[PDB]
Amino acid sequence: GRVIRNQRKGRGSVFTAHTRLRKAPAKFRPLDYAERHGYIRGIVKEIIHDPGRGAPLARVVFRSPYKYKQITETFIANEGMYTGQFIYAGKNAALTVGNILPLSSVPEGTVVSNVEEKPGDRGALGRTSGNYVTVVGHNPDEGKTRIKLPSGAKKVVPSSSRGMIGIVAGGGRTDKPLLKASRAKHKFAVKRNRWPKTRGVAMNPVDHPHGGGNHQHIGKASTISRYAAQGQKAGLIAARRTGLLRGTQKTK
Amino acid sequence: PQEVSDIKKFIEICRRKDASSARIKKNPKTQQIKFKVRCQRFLYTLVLKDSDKAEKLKQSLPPNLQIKDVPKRNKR
Amino acid sequence: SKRTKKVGISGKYGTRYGASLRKLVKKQEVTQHARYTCTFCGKNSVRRTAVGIWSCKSCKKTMAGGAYTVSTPAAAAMRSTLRRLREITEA
Amino acid sequence: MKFLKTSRVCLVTRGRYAGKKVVIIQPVDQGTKSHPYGHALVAGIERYPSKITRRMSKARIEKRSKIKPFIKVINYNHLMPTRYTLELEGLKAVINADTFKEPSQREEAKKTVKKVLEDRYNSGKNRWFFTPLRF
Amino acid sequence: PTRVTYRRRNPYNTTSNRTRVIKTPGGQLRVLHIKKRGTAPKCGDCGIKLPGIPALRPREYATISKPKKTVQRAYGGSRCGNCVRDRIIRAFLIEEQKIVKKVLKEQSQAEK
Amino acid sequence: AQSIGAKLALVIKSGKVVLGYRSTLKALRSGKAKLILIAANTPPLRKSELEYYSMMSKTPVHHYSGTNIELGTACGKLFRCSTMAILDAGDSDILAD
RNA sequence: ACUCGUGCCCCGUGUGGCGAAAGGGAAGCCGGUUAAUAUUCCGGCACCUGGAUGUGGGUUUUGCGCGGCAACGCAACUGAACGCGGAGACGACGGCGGGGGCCCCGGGCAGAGUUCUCUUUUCUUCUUAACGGUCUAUCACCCUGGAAACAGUUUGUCUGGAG
RNA sequence: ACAACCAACUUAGAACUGGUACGGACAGGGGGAAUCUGACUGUCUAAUUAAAACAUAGCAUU
Ligand SMILES: [Mg+2]
Ligand SMILES: [Mg+2]
Ligand SMILES: [Mg+2]
Ligand SMILES: [Mg+2]
Ligand SMILES: [Mg+2]
Ligand SMILES: [Mg+2]
Ligand SMILES: [Mg+2]
Ligand SMILES: [Mg+2]
Ligand SMILES: [Mg+2]
Ligand SMILES: [Mg+2]
Ligand SMILES: [Mg+2]
Ligand SMILES: [Mg+2]
Ligand SMILES: [Mg+2]
Ligand SMILES: [Mg+2]
Ligand SMILES: [Mg+2]
Ligand SMILES: [Mg+2]
Ligand SMILES: [Mg+2]
Ligand SMILES: [Mg+2]
Ligand SMILES: [Mg+2]
Ligand SMILES: [Mg+2]
Ligand SMILES: [Mg+2]
Ligand SMILES: [Mg+2]
Ligand SMILES: [Mg+2]
Ligand SMILES: [Mg+2]
Numbered sequence: 001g002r003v004i005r006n007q008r009k010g011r012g013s014v015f016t017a018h019t020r021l022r023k024a025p026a027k028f029r030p031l032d033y034a035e036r037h038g039y040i041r042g043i044v045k046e047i048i049h050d051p052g053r054g055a056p057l058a059r060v061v062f063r064s065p066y067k068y069k070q071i072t073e074t075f076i077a078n079e080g081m082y083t084g085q086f087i088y089a090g091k092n093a094a095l096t097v098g099n100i101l102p103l104s105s106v107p108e109g110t111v112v113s114n115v116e117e118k119p120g121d122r123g124a125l126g127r128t129s130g131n132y133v134t135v136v137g138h139n140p141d142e143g144k145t146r147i148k149l150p151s152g153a154k155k156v157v158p159s160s161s162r163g164m165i166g167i168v169a170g171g172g173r174t175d176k177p178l179l180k181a182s183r184a185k186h187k188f189a190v191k192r193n194r195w196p197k198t199r200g201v202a203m204n205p206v207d208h209p210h211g212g213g214n215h216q217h218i219g220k221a222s223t224i225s226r227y228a229a230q231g232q233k234a235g236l237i238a239a240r241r242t243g244l245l246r247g248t249q250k251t252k
Numbered sequence: 253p254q255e256v257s258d259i260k261k262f263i264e265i266c267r268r269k270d271a272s273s274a275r276i277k278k279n280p281k282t283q284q285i286k287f288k289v290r291c292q293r294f295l296y297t298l299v300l301k302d303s304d305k306a307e308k309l310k311q312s313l314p315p316n317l318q319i320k321d322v323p324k325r326n327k328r
Numbered sequence: 329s330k331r332t333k334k335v336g337i338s339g340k341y342g343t344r345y346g347a348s349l350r351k352l353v354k355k356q357e358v359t360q361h362a363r364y365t366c367t368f369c370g371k372n373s374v375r376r377t378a379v380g381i382w383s384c385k386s387c388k389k390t391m392a393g394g395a396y397t398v399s400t401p402a403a404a405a406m407r408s409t410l411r412r413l414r415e416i417t418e419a
Numbered sequence: 420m421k422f423l424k425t426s427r428v429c430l431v432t433r434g435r436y437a438g439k440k441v442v443i444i445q446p447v448d449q450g451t452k453s454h455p456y457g458h459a460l461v462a463g464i465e466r467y468p469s470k471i472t473r474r475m476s477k478a479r480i481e482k483r484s485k486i487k488p489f490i491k492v493i494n495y496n497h498l499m500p501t502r503y504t505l506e507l508e509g510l511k512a513v514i515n516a517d518t519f520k521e522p523s524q525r526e527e528a529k530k531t532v533k534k535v536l537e538d539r540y541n542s543g544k545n546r547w548f549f550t551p552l553r554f
Numbered sequence: 555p556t557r558v559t560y561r562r563r564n565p566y567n568t569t570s571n572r573t574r575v576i577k578t579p580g581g582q583l584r585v586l587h588i589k590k591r592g593t594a595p596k597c598g599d600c601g602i603k604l605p606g607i608p609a610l611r612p613r614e615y616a617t618i619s620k621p622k623k624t625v626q627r628a629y630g631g632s633r634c635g636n637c638v639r640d641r642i643i644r645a646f647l648i649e650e651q652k653i654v655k656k657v658l659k660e661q662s663q664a665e666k
Numbered sequence: 667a668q669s670i671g672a673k674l675a676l677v678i679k680s681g682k683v684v685l686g687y688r689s690t691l692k693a694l695r696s697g698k699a700k701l702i703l704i705a706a707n708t709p710p711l712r713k714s715e716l717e718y719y720s721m722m723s724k725t726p727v728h729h730y731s732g733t734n735i736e737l738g739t740a741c742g743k744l745f746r747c748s749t750m751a752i753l754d755a756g757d758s759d760i761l762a763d
Numbered sequence: 764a765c766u767c768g769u770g771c772c773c774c775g776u777g778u779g780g781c782g783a784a785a786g787g788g789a790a791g792c793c794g795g796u797u798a799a800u801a802u803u804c805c806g807g808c809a810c811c812u813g814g815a816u817g818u819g820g821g822u823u824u825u826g827c828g829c830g831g832c833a834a835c836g837c838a839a840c841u842g843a844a845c846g847c848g849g850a851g852a853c854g855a856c857g858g859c860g861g862g863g864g865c866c867c868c869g870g871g872c873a874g875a876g877u878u879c880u881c882u883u884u885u886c887u888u889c890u891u892a893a894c895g896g897u898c899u900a901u902c903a904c905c906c907u908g909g910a911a912a913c914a915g916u917u918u919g920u921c922u923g924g925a926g
Numbered sequence: 927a928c929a930a931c932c933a934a935c936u937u938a939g940a941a942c943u944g945g946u947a948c949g950g951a952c953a954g955g956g957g958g959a960a961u962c963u964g965a966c967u968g969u970c971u972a973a974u975u976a977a978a979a980c981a982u983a984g985c986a987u988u
């Protein structure tokens with residue numbers, strides 16, 4: 001048989017993400033002395049649209065504590081942020097929307113965005129439009145913080161991890177139907193070469209495990225073991241259950 | 253090419269060291285006389301409406317630099 | 329005049345994509361093309377430029393909003409909750 | 420109550436002298452035939468004295484403590500009045516809306532203003548007036 | 555109504571092959587290759603066009619005099635004047651507020 | 667307070683006011699402004715400028731809690747008003763407090 | 764910084780190449796000319812870049828222009844490091860307005876065609892480059908002033924006590 | 927409120943007239959009642975298959 005499309009995707013080549021129109025990655029400031037001990041003030045210059053990203057980004061200018069230059073950063077814009085707004089990043093920053101604070105100096109029950117998995121990593125969690133991370137609780141003796149992720153998972157991160165107060169802008173982007181093949185094409189044409197998608201059962205046996213046959217049918221259980229070989233993992237990988245979800249799920 | 257407004261500036265230009273030559277173009281149909289002086293960068297043209305001032309300017313011009321009269325149908 | 333009974337702005341789609349999908353698209357399209365009063369200058373000149381970006385034509389201020397509305401109810405509730413939970417910490 | 424009078428220190432916000440500090444010599448609250456609006460005859464600093472240190476020689480200090488003045492007729496709308504004020508007796512009636520009609524009078528008035536302002540500056544007083552505004 | 559041709563080896567309409575039509579003293583219609591239009595410099599604060607400065611190609615500014623390239627006031631180029639006035643007023647007000655805040659803190663928190 | 671609307675209506679009915687930034691600054695300069703009202707959503711720079719002018723004029727400032735739309739509506743106009751000045755309080759007691 | 768290259772003193776986070784004859788980009792037009800080249804040759808008239816030092820002009824002599832309320836103007840009218848900003852520099856489509864060229868109509872000039880009859884007729888020519896000077900040319904911005912009996916206004920819109 | 931001067935075309939109405947003819951060439955939709963099937967626009971076996979096949983938005987699962 002052939003190498004299947006899912007296997008080919010990992011080679012790169014035509015499946016590499018598009019990057020020309022992306023200006024800079026969305027990252028916090030590097031964790032420095034000012035952010036560790038007090039706060040630093042930055043000015044929002046513009047709210048820009050980043051192709052391939054649903055959420056808008058905010059360009060924020062800060063002063064260098066050690067040089068005469070000025071530094072422009074690219075944050076994920078939280079909804080409610082505006083051009084000409086002062087934002088504050090640090091331990092002693094006020095608890096207002098757009099401020100970047102360590103989770104230790106944040107009370108329980110507030111939502112943040114671009115939460116660092118570890119301090120200094122400049123943001124990893126809850127960075128997509130309409131998404132946020134909730135600060136469930138604190139453990140000061142352990143120096144840790146329990147948070148709730150957009151997926152519903154519970155995580156524990158060091159209290160020094162930073163986050164931006166508020167909710168990622170971009171609202172309910174997925175609330176309107178795409179309604180058109182062209183609109184799906186435009187959505188993915190700035191992300192990746194993954195659209196359109198041909199069904200495996202419409203292929204031939206040389207091309208996919210779902211293969212051919214005189215009727216379009218999978219012919220064997222579509223749930224595939226977690227430890228199946230590469231080239232076998234087509235369908236529902238390591239599926240605990242299948243079928244329509246007809247009630248609440250114990251797992252979360 | 254540059255137009256010179258007045259006779260004093262025109263003669264001052266004609267006194268220049270880089271002034272190569274000059275020529276009078278007579279347009280009888282317009283009763284016009286044009287004094288053209290060729291300097292290094294620009295050709296300077298002064299326009300006069302009468303012949304008396306033209307003759308006085310011609311006689312008052314520097315005598316070192318050569319003067320022509322622009323014959324009709326200049327040959328290649 | 330009216331020019332249309334119920335299709336409204338979704339009449340550009342003709343008979344395609346299905347009535348329910350047309351209504352769902354219309355719901356977001358109306359709010360995404362509506363004009364809004366600026367919070368900063370008070371003029372009714374705030375309009376959507378990108379998916380989550382709303383700019384005022386008069387005072388030239390740009391703000392981050394929702395996909396098809398300037399403010400989402402989740403963000404409004406979060407702002408109120410933040411104000412309350414910050415005031416109970418300050419004083 | 421009036422606050423825009425003689426001696427009132429203001430900042431120029433428009434024109435070639437935008438950002439420069441001036442002292443009012445004569446306020447004209449009612450307009451004249453020319454300038455039919457509330458305005459003021461003012462005298463200000465164009466080139467502030469340079470920074471001087473304890474380590475320079477007296478010659479360098481005296482060369483750096485030089486002021487280039489200017490004289491202006493300015494609209495009230497193009498001024499920012501300050502809480503500061505400057506009563507200098509030498510600038511009592513330097514300009515009278517007729518010095519602006521002859522360039523020689525302007526030069527003489529500028530000379531007088533320069534002398535008075537330098538004397539006041541090396542007097543050590545009203546340092547806010549002689550410190551340039553940073554914007 | 556004679557038809558014209560490009561006068562250079564580039565046969566494509568590539569936003570750099572801009573041409574206009576002229577009539578020569580020889581009495582025939584011809585193409586003149588022209589450069590791109592000049593662009594007016596913008597304010598660094600508000601982004602509007604700056605009055606009093608010509609719209610040229612960037613290399614052309616190196617051959618015109620400074621007074622034609624700037625206006626005679628603080629931030630002559632690159633700021634629009636309204637922004638300069640806003641800067642002046644804002645700077646003065648912030649320094650005034652800072653002075654009164656420091657004097658208030660010294661008088662009401664260090665009075666003992 | 668809530669009574670500011672009634673006081674403003676009475677002042678406009680009987681006394682006299684100027685509505686707008688330029689006229690308010692003119693009144694502050696001439697010294698005939700008895701009180702100035704600044705709307706909540708007035709730009710911070712303009713609000714600070716008006717406060718400094720009123721400090722110079724020894725004129726009281728009231729920070730109206732509404733926007734410019736609400737301030738204009740309170741003044742009984744169909745247009746917005748970011749700031750205004752009262753040149754004469756008539757039967758109203760707006761200057762009492 | 765020395766007669767003489769080699770004596771020092773500051774800044775530093777960076778520290779390669781190739782890759783477009785349609786992307787970015789300093790600057791040339793007209794007339795004529797050959798059997799065959801020409802925006803390349805010839806004639807005239809220009810422009811750009813780099814380097815040098817002159818004449819005049821301007822500014823100053825303890826100093827680095829002047830004018831205008833202002834938007835800004837004027838032939839210049841000092842300016843290291845360091846920093847900020849602009850330009851280069853950007854999609855597709857719609858109607859509207861200005862300009863060039865072409866087309867069309869009328870009259871006149873010169874030539875040609877037709878003319879048993881008719882046709883003040885049919886056709887052709889009547890041109891003006893780069894580069895400059897000067898005066899204008901929507902949008903915007905400034906000053907005065909303070910608008911409801913709201914007003915101005917586009918084909919469409921929109922704009923105004925933030926004037 | 928009329929007169930004069932300037933300027934194109936677009937529409938409407940009437941009389942007369944001939945071959946009862948006139949979008950005179952050219953240019954230029956046949957239509958209707960239903961059934962099966964794929965929602966639609968789009969794509970493919972270059973050189974025997976253009977389809978009901980593929981894709982699609984939507985839905986669902988992992
Ligand atoms: Mg294989
Ligand atoms: Mg598929
Ligand atoms: Mg098949
Ligand atoms: Mg197989
Ligand atoms: Mg299998
Ligand atoms: Mg099937
Ligand atoms: Mg079976
Ligand atoms: Mg190369
Ligand atoms: Mg090219
Ligand atoms: Mg040549
Ligand atoms: Mg030649
Ligand atoms: Mg040179
Ligand atoms: Mg000299
Ligand atoms: Mg390009
Ligand atoms: Mg012409
Ligand atoms: Mg035609
Ligand atoms: Mg004719
Ligand atoms: Mg000409
Ligand atoms: Mg018919
Ligand atoms: Mg057909
Ligand atoms: Mg089909
Ligand atoms: Mg294909
Ligand atoms: Mg075939
Ligand atoms: Mg085959």
Ligand SMILES: [Mg+2]
Nearest residue numbers: 971974975976
């Ligand atoms: Mg076939």
